[PDB]
Amino acid sequence: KPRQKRTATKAYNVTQAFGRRGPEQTQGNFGDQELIRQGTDYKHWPQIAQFAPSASAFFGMSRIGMEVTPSGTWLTYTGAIKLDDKDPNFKDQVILLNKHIDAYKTFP
């Protein structure tokens, strides 16, 4: 199964599917120990998943590039998704996301 279509679970976790969290430019940086171990089996996965784009919105919203390099041909992307700072749930949404962003720094 191609990487971008994979689904992390406890049986095939975030490290297994998507590699060690870390600081380098195309290394993923999201997930505390719990989410890394659990993937989509994490009990608050739906709270995170609400921010993930549809395929339509991924190619609609993103800045897309294509790079040909010694490692192969890559589809590059950047973008931003705006939260609803008016939502009463907003504060708890930020905390949850901040909890996973760069969490790897605090453990081996």
Ligand X SMILES: CC1(C)S[C@@H]2[C@H](NC(=O)[C@H](N)c3ccccc3)C(=O)N2[C@H]1C(=O)O
- Which residues bind to ligand X, rule: CB under 6 A? 43-44, 92
Q: How far apart are CA 25 and CA 51, in angstroms?
A: 21
Q: How far apart are CA 82 and CA 85, in angstroms?
A: 9
For 103, other C-beta atoms within 10 Å of its C-beta total 18
Residue 92: which of ligand X, its own copies, none does it interact with, CB under 5 to 8 A by kind? ligand X
Q: How far apart are CA 97 and CA 22, in angstroms?
A: 17
- For the bound state, the minimum distance from the C-beta of residue 89 to ligand X, rounded and expressed in Å, comes to 7
Q: Does 106 bind its own copies (CB under 8 A)?
A: no
Q: How far apart are CA 38 and CA 24, in angstroms?
A: 23
> Which of 11, 78, 88, 106 contacts its own copies by CB under 8 A?
78
Q: Which residues bind its own copies (CB under 8 A)?
A: 2-8, 14, 17-19, 25-31, 39-40, 48-68, 71-85, 90, 94, 97-98, 100-101
